Nucleic acid binder design. Structure first.
Lengths: 168, 168
RNA sequence: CGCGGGGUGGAGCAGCCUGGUAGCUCGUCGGGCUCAUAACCCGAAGAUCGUCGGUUCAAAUCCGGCCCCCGCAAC
RNA sequence: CGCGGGGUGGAGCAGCCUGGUAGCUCGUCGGGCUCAUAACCCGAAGAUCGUCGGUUCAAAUCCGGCCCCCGCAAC
């Protein structure tokens, strides 16, 4: 099952290793208080085992971006404010032992489900992500992430309405 | 009871009248698609009557602000990003017939409860509000809203931890 | 769904209304005729009709979802 | 809770460790003495110990939550 971090963590963190080093450091170093200080929410894809074998995680932090980053002025005439409510997908990683099996997209989908249940609360438009990787940018575009073109040139977006349609 | 807008609205909107005109226009004019386009979420304080007597409402839109707006550099050393996850309390109003009875604060508290349940999802820090009214700024400071001093000089803030402590 | 219009060679228009059919003016190029040409005559290429779906033996055409562009009232 | 220090007249320090007590140097001002003064002698004011709580007959002092400030490693 997929689950958020409990109050008592009791996770095994060192034997985990995703692809990129920077994300390993983000896991080992910055995540603890950022979760406890309610900077972001971390969701964990684990085996539900006693060892809590760590194989995936993702981070969600609400955010804003310049409205001009939208590609279509038609969508701009729909939003009456200079800033756009967004949720930044801060980081997303799966252990290397499972890469090439689509669990990346499964995590993105669970995150979209959570963002949908959240849209019931503060009604933001979808998922913002600033993908440094080129593979990540193309991988997101494969799932249909809208490229945001503005002062930022590396972000991809996913609308709330597409999330509604995905869950029928 | 307090409730969000259903799919079928069936509300009585004209006989409602809050204090400020601008908010009346925001209600009559911009709210419909902003709810339907998932720009924000509107919560309604109604009598649960057949007429759906409208006496209060508030709007929530996730947002960001410059980190330098925080008053204490101590809290700045806690947040490792230039932008801070926030939820903007876009608008808040109660019908004039009930002003001076504290339902303003009751709505703020229900909104805080919702932001708490949301903090379980994207872990933002609390409530951002840009209060044009001076009465509103002082009224928020009475409930303990932290004034944000930065490029913006009119916003007030409420942390997530205070919300946790309020609900015991 | 704020009101309304619109989607097609490279550009700009008609083809609908009325299901079966790719048309017109520029532009490109080829050819013919001229001392010669952006001028005159002839010819060729490029759009599969914004995308997706439905009905139909068949769809640019009728119907629905969505996308995009333009003007205006509001921000 | 990244590591560590710190909170007190207007500024900078000690008072803890050891519960009962407001102290020192500047600064302000008043007075005395000088041709006179920031110089010498005397005196006064201003902090209720960051905030909140707990224990105690009693708290700056012990204990807890929180707030704020400084340095450094990281961003």
């Amino acid at each position: 099952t997929i689950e958020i971090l409990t109050d008592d963590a009791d996770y095994d963190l060192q034997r985990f290793d995703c692809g990129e080093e920077a994300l390993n450091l983000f896991l080992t170093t910055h995540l603890v208080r950022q979760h406890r200080n309610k900077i972001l929410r971390a969701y964990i894809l684990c085996r539900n085992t006693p060892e809590r074998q760590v194989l995936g995680y993702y981070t969600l932090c609400g955010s804003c971006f310049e409205r001009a980053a939208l590609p279509s002025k038609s969508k701009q005439k729909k939003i009456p404010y200079k800033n756009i409510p967004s949720v930044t997908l801060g980081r997303l990683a799966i252990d290397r032992s499972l890469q090439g099996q689509g669990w990346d997209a499964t995590l993105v989908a669970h995150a979209m489900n959570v963002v949908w249940s959240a849209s019931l609360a503060v009604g933001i438009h979808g998922l913002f992500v600033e993908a440094l990787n080129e593979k990540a940018h193309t991988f997101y575009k494969s799932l249909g992430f809208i490229p945001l073109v503005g002062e930022n040139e590396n972000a991809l977006f996913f609308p709330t309405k597409s999330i509604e349609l995905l869950f029928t």
